[PDB]
Amino acid sequence: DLTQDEFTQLSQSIAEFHTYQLGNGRCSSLLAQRIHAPPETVWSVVRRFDRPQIYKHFIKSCNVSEDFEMRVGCTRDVNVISGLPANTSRERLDLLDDDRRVTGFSITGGEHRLRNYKSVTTVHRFEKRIWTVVLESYVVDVPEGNSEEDTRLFADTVIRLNLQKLASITEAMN
Ligand SMILES: CC1=CC(=O)CC(C)(C)[C@@]1(O)/C=C/C(C)=C\C(=O)O
């Protein structure tokens, strides 16, 4: 996946936001997407907590309060497209750092099986031409009698598809 030069450059961010030391019954993974677009452009979409459906394929709609303010602790209600093993997710914004380009959220409830899910998404400048690397990591409980391996495959597949869609949206923005 990540090159040596990408790792090195990305080392302290990964230690700071994307490394976990967990007990059993919980699992994590880290995923990376390269985007051939300025990190200002990528971050302008990543940080828009009220409109995840701009890049998240499986989200049919997202509702926020009439008094919504973009501030740690604000919440959103997302509704999943039809036919899926989940219908809704209730999510809380945990991080919004406009200097470092760090965001994250937690799933506090809803109709789905990704209990105590929390993810962190970070945006990184690379200079070849300016490009961007996005890291996204999550921790989640392993539902009793499911395996850690199926849980990770599920989360990873959704995050990977979302970060691909992010890359296509943000590259089209040039
Ligand atoms: C597509 C989908 C299906 C589910 O079964 C769970 C949930 C409804 C939470 C989800 O929206 C999960 C989305 C997660 C993994 C990544 C995200 O959105 O950053």
Swiss-Prot record:
It is found in: Cytoplasm; Nucleus; Cell membrane. GO terms for cellular component: cytoplasm; nucleus; plasma membrane; plastid; protein phosphatase inhibitor complex. Abscisate binds at residues 56, 86-91, 113-119, 136. Residues 20-171 are annotated as: START-like. A motif (Gate loop) lies at residues 82-86. Receptor for abscisic acid (ABA) required for ABA-mediated responses such as stomatal closure and germination inhibition. Inhibits the activity of group-A protein phosphatases type 2C (PP2Cs) when activated by ABA. Can be activated by both (-)-ABA and (+)-ABA. This is Abscisic acid receptor PYL1. The chain holds residues 31 to 209 of 221 of the full protein.
